[PDB]
Design a binder for this molecule. Sequence first.
Ligand code: NAP
Length: 315
Amino acid sequence: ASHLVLYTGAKMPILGLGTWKSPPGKVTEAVKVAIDLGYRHIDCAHVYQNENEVGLGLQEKLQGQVVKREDLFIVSKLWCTDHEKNLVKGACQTTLRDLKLDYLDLYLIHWPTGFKPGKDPFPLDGDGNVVPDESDFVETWEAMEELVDEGLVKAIGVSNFNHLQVEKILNKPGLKYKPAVNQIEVHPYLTQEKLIEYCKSKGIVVTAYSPLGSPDRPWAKPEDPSLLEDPRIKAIAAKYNKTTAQVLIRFPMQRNLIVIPKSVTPERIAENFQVFDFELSPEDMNTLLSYNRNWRVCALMSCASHKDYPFHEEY
Ligand SMILES: NC(=O)c1ccc[n+]([C@@H]2O[C@H](COP(=O)([O-])OP(=O)(O)OC[C@H]3O[C@@H](n4cnc5c(N)ncnc54)[C@H](OP(=O)(O)O)[C@@H]3O)[C@@H](O)[C@H]2O)c1
Protein backbone atom coordinates (compact mmCIF):
# COMPACT_ATOMS: atom_id res chain seq x y z
CA ALA A 1 0.00 0.00 0.00
CA SER A 2 3.00 2.29 0.80
CA HIS A 3 1.56 3.00 4.26
CA LEU A 4 -0.92 1.32 6.58
CA VAL A 5 -3.08 3.70 8.70
CA LEU A 6 -3.17 3.52 12.46
CA TYR A 7 -6.42 4.00 14.33
CA THR A 8 -5.42 7.60 15.29
CA GLY A 9 -5.39 8.52 11.65
CA ALA A 10 -1.61 8.52 11.17
CA LYS A 11 -0.08 7.06 8.09
CA MET A 12 2.62 4.69 9.07
CA PRO A 13 5.14 3.86 6.27
CA ILE A 14 5.01 0.15 5.42
CA LEU A 15 8.81 -0.19 5.08
CA GLY A 16 11.21 1.11 7.69
CA LEU A 17 14.86 0.80 8.56
CA GLY A 18 15.62 -1.42 11.54
CA THR A 19 18.58 -0.41 13.68
CA TRP A 20 19.14 -3.41 16.07
CA LYS A 21 22.77 -4.39 15.96
CA SER A 22 23.49 -1.44 13.63
CA PRO A 23 26.88 -0.34 15.19
CA PRO A 24 27.06 3.33 16.37
CA GLY A 25 29.81 4.10 13.84
CA LYS A 26 27.68 2.81 10.92
CA VAL A 27 24.09 3.70 11.77
CA THR A 28 24.36 7.47 11.03
CA GLU A 29 25.40 6.89 7.37
CA ALA A 30 22.86 3.98 7.14
CA VAL A 31 20.06 6.33 8.37
CA LYS A 32 21.31 9.05 6.01
CA VAL A 33 21.52 6.75 3.00
CA ALA A 34 18.02 5.33 3.74
CA ILE A 35 16.40 8.75 3.93
CA ASP A 36 18.22 9.54 0.66
CA LEU A 37 16.66 6.34 -0.78
CA GLY A 38 13.16 7.43 0.28
CA TYR A 39 12.74 5.51 3.58
CA ARG A 40 10.61 7.64 5.84
CA HIS A 41 10.34 5.32 8.86
CA ILE A 42 13.12 4.30 11.22
CA ASP A 43 12.63 1.78 14.01
CA CYS A 44 14.83 2.50 17.03
CA ALA A 45 15.11 1.54 20.65
CA HIS A 46 16.90 2.67 23.74
CA VAL A 47 18.42 -0.73 24.24
CA TYR A 48 20.10 -0.76 20.80
CA GLN A 49 22.68 1.80 22.13
CA ASN A 50 22.88 3.88 19.00
CA GLU A 51 19.89 6.25 19.21
CA ASN A 52 22.30 9.18 19.58
CA GLU A 53 23.93 8.16 16.38
CA VAL A 54 20.52 7.65 14.74
CA GLY A 55 19.74 11.21 15.96
CA LEU A 56 22.84 12.52 14.19
CA GLY A 57 21.72 11.13 10.81
CA LEU A 58 18.22 12.41 11.25
CA GLN A 59 19.37 15.86 12.43
CA GLU A 60 21.59 16.17 9.40
CA LYS A 61 18.75 15.30 7.05
CA LEU A 62 16.30 17.62 8.83
CA GLN A 63 18.66 20.65 8.97
CA GLY A 64 19.71 19.92 5.40
CA GLN A 65 16.01 20.28 4.45
CA VAL A 66 16.03 16.83 2.82
CA VAL A 67 12.93 15.88 4.86
CA LYS A 68 10.34 17.63 7.01
CA ARG A 69 9.71 16.14 10.51
CA GLU A 70 6.06 15.45 9.55
CA ASP A 71 7.34 13.25 6.72
CA LEU A 72 9.33 11.06 9.12
CA PHE A 73 7.94 8.18 11.20
CA ILE A 74 10.38 7.52 14.03
CA VAL A 75 9.67 4.71 16.47
CA SER A 76 11.46 3.92 19.66
CA LYS A 77 10.85 1.53 22.56
CA LEU A 78 10.69 1.53 26.36
CA TRP A 79 13.13 -0.99 27.78
CA CYS A 80 12.31 -3.66 30.31
CA THR A 81 14.27 -2.01 33.16
CA ASP A 82 12.06 1.09 32.70
CA HIS A 83 8.63 -0.41 33.18
CA GLU A 84 7.97 1.01 36.70
CA LYS A 85 5.33 3.73 36.13
CA ASN A 86 7.57 6.53 37.50
CA LEU A 87 10.47 5.55 35.23
CA VAL A 88 8.57 5.76 31.90
CA LYS A 89 8.63 9.56 31.23
CA GLY A 90 12.33 9.62 31.99
CA ALA A 91 13.09 6.88 29.53
CA CYS A 92 11.02 8.52 26.83
CA GLN A 93 12.92 11.82 27.48
CA THR A 94 16.39 10.16 27.25
CA THR A 95 15.35 8.65 23.91
CA LEU A 96 13.95 12.01 22.66
CA ARG A 97 17.10 13.87 23.60
CA ASP A 98 19.35 11.12 22.06
CA LEU A 99 17.27 11.13 18.90
CA LYS A 100 17.24 15.01 19.07
CA LEU A 101 13.54 15.07 18.45
CA ASP A 102 10.63 16.76 20.20
CA TYR A 103 8.14 13.88 19.89
CA LEU A 104 8.14 10.28 18.72
CA ASP A 105 5.60 9.02 16.24
CA LEU A 106 5.30 5.71 18.02
CA TYR A 107 6.71 4.50 21.27
CA LEU A 108 6.50 0.75 22.00
CA ILE A 109 6.74 -1.26 25.26
CA HIS A 110 9.62 -3.40 24.01
CA TRP A 111 8.75 -6.69 25.86
CA PRO A 112 5.87 -7.39 28.34
CA THR A 113 8.59 -8.25 30.87
CA GLY A 114 9.71 -5.64 33.40
CA PHE A 115 13.25 -6.23 34.71
CA LYS A 116 14.59 -4.84 37.93
CA PRO A 117 15.49 -1.15 37.34
CA GLY A 118 19.08 -0.14 37.27
CA LYS A 119 21.62 0.72 34.56
CA ASP A 120 22.29 -2.93 33.64
CA PRO A 121 19.83 -3.79 30.76
CA PHE A 122 19.47 -7.51 31.62
CA PRO A 123 19.96 -7.84 35.42
CA LEU A 124 20.86 -11.44 36.02
CA ASP A 125 20.72 -13.46 39.21
CA GLY A 126 23.24 -16.14 40.30
CA ASP A 127 21.33 -18.89 38.50
CA GLY A 128 21.51 -16.65 35.37
CA ASN A 129 17.80 -15.93 34.78
CA VAL A 130 16.66 -12.27 34.76
CA VAL A 131 15.48 -10.41 37.83
CA PRO A 132 11.84 -9.10 37.56
CA ASP A 133 10.74 -5.73 38.93
CA GLU A 134 7.54 -5.20 40.94
CA SER A 135 5.34 -4.03 37.99
CA ASP A 136 2.52 -5.18 35.70
CA PHE A 137 2.64 -3.84 32.13
CA VAL A 138 -0.92 -2.42 32.58
CA GLU A 139 0.64 0.11 35.05
CA THR A 140 3.42 0.77 32.48
CA TRP A 141 0.66 1.23 29.87
CA GLU A 142 -0.88 3.98 31.99
CA ALA A 143 2.38 5.91 32.05
CA MET A 144 2.73 5.39 28.28
CA GLU A 145 -0.73 7.10 27.98
CA GLU A 146 0.56 10.16 29.79
CA LEU A 147 3.22 10.51 27.12
CA VAL A 148 0.43 10.86 24.49
CA ASP A 149 -1.38 13.38 26.70
CA GLU A 150 1.73 15.57 26.87
CA GLY A 151 2.54 15.31 23.18
CA LEU A 152 5.81 13.41 23.72
CA VAL A 153 4.61 10.60 21.46
CA LYS A 154 1.89 10.66 18.84
CA ALA A 155 0.89 6.96 19.30
CA ILE A 156 1.74 4.10 21.76
CA GLY A 157 1.98 0.37 21.16
CA VAL A 158 3.52 -2.87 22.34
CA SER A 159 5.97 -5.39 20.98
CA ASN A 160 6.11 -9.16 21.59
CA PHE A 161 2.78 -9.13 23.39
CA ASN A 162 0.75 -12.29 23.06
CA HIS A 163 -2.99 -11.90 22.44
CA LEU A 164 -3.95 -12.36 26.13
CA GLN A 165 -1.47 -9.64 27.06
CA VAL A 166 -2.97 -7.32 24.48
CA GLU A 167 -6.40 -8.28 25.92
CA LYS A 168 -5.40 -7.28 29.42
CA ILE A 169 -4.55 -3.77 28.04
CA LEU A 170 -7.77 -3.55 25.92
CA ASN A 171 -9.88 -4.60 28.95
CA LYS A 172 -8.17 -2.24 31.39
CA PRO A 173 -10.59 -0.04 33.41
CA GLY A 174 -9.80 3.66 32.62
CA LEU A 175 -8.05 2.78 29.27
CA LYS A 176 -7.41 6.05 27.41
CA TYR A 177 -5.51 4.86 24.32
CA LYS A 178 -5.23 1.35 22.99
CA PRO A 179 -2.05 -0.13 21.37
CA ALA A 180 -1.89 1.24 17.93
CA VAL A 181 0.80 -1.34 16.90
CA ASN A 182 2.06 -4.75 17.99
CA GLN A 183 5.56 -5.33 16.65
CA ILE A 184 6.36 -9.03 16.65
CA GLU A 185 8.68 -11.50 14.93
CA VAL A 186 7.24 -12.64 11.65
CA HIS A 187 8.92 -14.51 8.80
CA PRO A 188 8.18 -17.89 6.87
CA TYR A 189 9.36 -19.95 9.82
CA LEU A 190 6.99 -18.06 12.21
CA THR A 191 4.12 -16.85 10.10
CA GLN A 192 2.12 -15.68 13.08
CA GLU A 193 -1.27 -15.70 11.27
CA LYS A 194 -3.18 -16.24 14.54
CA LEU A 195 -1.64 -13.21 16.40
CA ILE A 196 -1.70 -11.10 13.23
CA GLU A 197 -5.43 -11.97 12.73
CA TYR A 198 -6.11 -11.19 16.32
CA CYS A 199 -4.47 -7.70 16.29
CA LYS A 200 -6.11 -6.92 12.97
CA SER A 201 -9.53 -7.82 14.47
CA LYS A 202 -8.75 -5.40 17.27
CA GLY A 203 -7.58 -2.63 14.93
CA ILE A 204 -3.95 -2.85 15.87
CA VAL A 205 -1.33 -2.68 13.07
CA VAL A 206 1.36 -5.34 12.90
CA THR A 207 5.02 -4.64 12.23
CA ALA A 208 6.96 -7.71 11.27
CA TYR A 209 10.48 -7.62 12.66
CA SER A 210 13.37 -9.85 11.58
CA PRO A 211 11.83 -10.41 8.06
CA LEU A 212 15.03 -12.21 6.96
CA GLY A 213 15.57 -14.30 10.13
CA SER A 214 18.46 -12.09 11.44
CA PRO A 215 21.73 -13.71 10.14
CA ASP A 216 23.75 -11.50 12.49
CA ARG A 217 22.00 -12.50 15.75
CA PRO A 218 24.75 -13.35 18.37
CA TRP A 219 23.31 -16.78 19.10
CA ALA A 220 23.57 -17.93 15.46
CA LYS A 221 25.37 -21.22 15.75
CA PRO A 222 26.35 -23.13 12.46
CA GLU A 223 23.39 -25.58 12.33
CA ASP A 224 20.78 -22.79 12.18
CA PRO A 225 18.27 -22.43 9.33
CA SER A 226 19.12 -19.48 7.12
CA LEU A 227 15.95 -18.11 5.39
CA LEU A 228 18.12 -16.14 2.92
CA GLU A 229 20.09 -19.14 1.77
CA ASP A 230 17.23 -21.64 1.95
CA PRO A 231 17.21 -23.03 -1.66
CA ARG A 232 13.41 -23.08 -1.76
CA ILE A 233 12.96 -19.29 -1.36
CA LYS A 234 16.01 -18.62 -3.52
CA ALA A 235 14.16 -20.59 -6.25
CA ILE A 236 11.04 -18.43 -6.04
CA ALA A 237 13.45 -15.42 -6.10
CA ALA A 238 15.06 -16.75 -9.29
CA LYS A 239 11.66 -16.80 -10.89
CA TYR A 240 10.98 -13.24 -9.74
CA ASN A 241 14.53 -12.05 -10.69
CA LYS A 242 14.57 -10.49 -7.30
CA THR A 243 16.74 -11.60 -4.31
CA THR A 244 15.77 -13.93 -1.43
CA ALA A 245 15.88 -10.74 0.66
CA GLN A 246 13.57 -8.61 -1.52
CA VAL A 247 11.00 -11.43 -1.65
CA LEU A 248 11.15 -12.11 2.11
CA ILE A 249 10.51 -8.35 2.54
CA ARG A 250 7.60 -8.34 0.00
CA PHE A 251 5.89 -11.24 1.85
CA PRO A 252 4.80 -9.32 5.11
CA MET A 253 3.95 -6.33 2.91
CA GLN A 254 1.56 -8.51 0.93
CA ARG A 255 0.10 -9.65 4.22
CA ASN A 256 -0.58 -5.99 5.11
CA LEU A 257 2.14 -5.92 7.77
CA ILE A 258 4.68 -3.09 8.18
CA VAL A 259 8.21 -4.59 7.53
CA ILE A 260 11.36 -3.16 9.18
CA PRO A 261 14.49 -4.85 7.68
CA LYS A 262 17.84 -3.98 9.23
CA SER A 263 20.85 -3.14 7.15
CA VAL A 264 23.85 -0.91 7.64
CA THR A 265 25.18 -1.83 4.17
CA PRO A 266 24.24 0.97 1.65
CA GLU A 267 23.72 -1.38 -1.26
CA ARG A 268 21.44 -3.67 0.79
CA ILE A 269 19.57 -0.64 2.17
CA ALA A 270 18.80 0.27 -1.52
CA GLU A 271 17.93 -3.34 -2.48
CA ASN A 272 15.51 -3.54 0.49
CA PHE A 273 13.74 -0.40 -0.72
CA GLN A 274 13.53 -1.92 -4.22
CA VAL A 275 10.49 -4.04 -3.30
CA PHE A 276 7.62 -1.78 -4.49
CA ASP A 277 7.73 -3.06 -8.12
CA PHE A 278 6.09 -6.46 -8.14
CA GLU A 279 3.62 -8.76 -6.38
CA LEU A 280 3.96 -12.41 -5.46
CA SER A 281 1.33 -14.60 -7.08
CA PRO A 282 -0.99 -16.33 -4.54
CA GLU A 283 0.67 -19.77 -4.78
CA ASP A 284 3.98 -18.12 -3.70
CA MET A 285 2.26 -16.51 -0.75
CA ASN A 286 0.93 -19.98 0.17
CA THR A 287 4.34 -21.59 -0.55
CA LEU A 288 6.05 -19.30 2.02
CA LEU A 289 3.24 -19.44 4.61
CA SER A 290 3.55 -23.23 4.62
CA TYR A 291 7.09 -23.01 5.97
CA ASN A 292 5.69 -22.21 9.48
CA ARG A 293 8.13 -24.14 11.60
CA ASN A 294 7.26 -21.86 14.57
CA TRP A 295 10.95 -21.03 14.75
CA ARG A 296 11.68 -18.11 16.86
CA VAL A 297 14.83 -16.15 16.52
CA CYS A 298 13.91 -13.88 19.47
CA ALA A 299 12.74 -16.16 22.20
CA LEU A 300 14.26 -14.41 25.27
CA MET A 301 14.97 -17.73 26.97
CA SER A 302 16.68 -15.89 29.89
CA CYS A 303 13.24 -14.59 30.84
CA ALA A 304 11.21 -17.81 30.29
CA SER A 305 10.33 -18.03 33.96
CA HIS A 306 9.10 -14.43 34.10
CA LYS A 307 5.38 -14.08 34.97
CA ASP A 308 4.80 -12.03 31.76
CA TYR A 309 7.00 -14.02 29.47
CA PRO A 310 4.99 -13.90 26.26
CA PHE A 311 5.76 -17.16 24.54
CA HIS A 312 4.30 -19.95 26.69
CA GLU A 313 0.98 -19.08 25.13
CA GLU A 314 0.14 -20.39 21.61
CA TYR A 315 -0.28 -16.87 20.22
N1 NAP B 1 10.66 -5.41 19.03
C1 NAP B 1 11.60 -6.34 19.12
O1 NAP B 1 11.71 -7.10 20.08
C2 NAP B 1 12.60 -6.44 17.96
C3 NAP B 1 13.45 -7.54 17.95
C4 NAP B 1 14.31 -7.78 16.88
C5 NAP B 1 14.34 -6.89 15.82
N2 NAP B 1 13.52 -5.76 15.83
C6 NAP B 1 13.64 -4.76 14.74
O2 NAP B 1 13.63 -5.48 13.49
C7 NAP B 1 14.73 -5.01 12.70
C8 NAP B 1 15.07 -6.08 11.67
O3 NAP B 1 15.36 -7.34 12.29
P1 NAP B 1 16.86 -7.88 12.61
O4 NAP B 1 17.86 -6.78 12.62
O5 NAP B 1 16.74 -8.71 13.83
O6 NAP B 1 17.16 -8.81 11.35
P2 NAP B 1 16.75 -8.88 9.81
O7 NAP B 1 16.28 -7.59 9.24
O8 NAP B 1 15.91 -10.09 9.61
O9 NAP B 1 18.20 -9.19 9.20
C9 NAP B 1 19.30 -8.29 9.36
C10 NAP B 1 20.51 -9.04 8.82
O10 NAP B 1 20.27 -9.40 7.44
C11 NAP B 1 21.16 -8.66 6.58
N3 NAP B 1 20.46 -8.10 5.39
C12 NAP B 1 19.67 -7.01 5.33
N4 NAP B 1 19.31 -6.71 4.07
C13 NAP B 1 19.90 -7.67 3.37
C14 NAP B 1 19.82 -7.80 2.00
N5 NAP B 1 19.18 -6.92 1.24
N6 NAP B 1 20.49 -8.84 1.47
C15 NAP B 1 21.17 -9.71 2.22
N7 NAP B 1 21.23 -9.58 3.55
C16 NAP B 1 20.61 -8.56 4.15
C17 NAP B 1 21.80 -7.59 7.44
O11 NAP B 1 23.16 -7.35 7.06
P3 NAP B 1 23.80 -5.88 7.12
O12 NAP B 1 23.12 -5.11 8.18
O13 NAP B 1 25.22 -6.20 7.40
O14 NAP B 1 23.55 -5.36 5.77
C18 NAP B 1 21.79 -8.24 8.81
O15 NAP B 1 22.91 -9.11 8.96
C19 NAP B 1 15.78 -4.72 13.76
O16 NAP B 1 16.87 -3.90 13.33
C20 NAP B 1 14.96 -4.00 14.80
O17 NAP B 1 14.84 -2.61 14.46
C21 NAP B 1 12.64 -5.52 16.91
